[PDB]
């Protein structure tokens with residue numbers, strides 16, 4: 001589905017589904 005992770009903004013997925021290491025502002029993708 002069209003859900004551009006507005007958190008990391010490096011892929012489409014849910015925040016909780018964000019499997020990225022870091023996110024915007026280079027934040028540590030929290031659990």
Ligand SMILES: [Zn+2]
Pocket residue numbers: 005007008009010011013014015018019020023
């Ligand atoms: Zn993400």
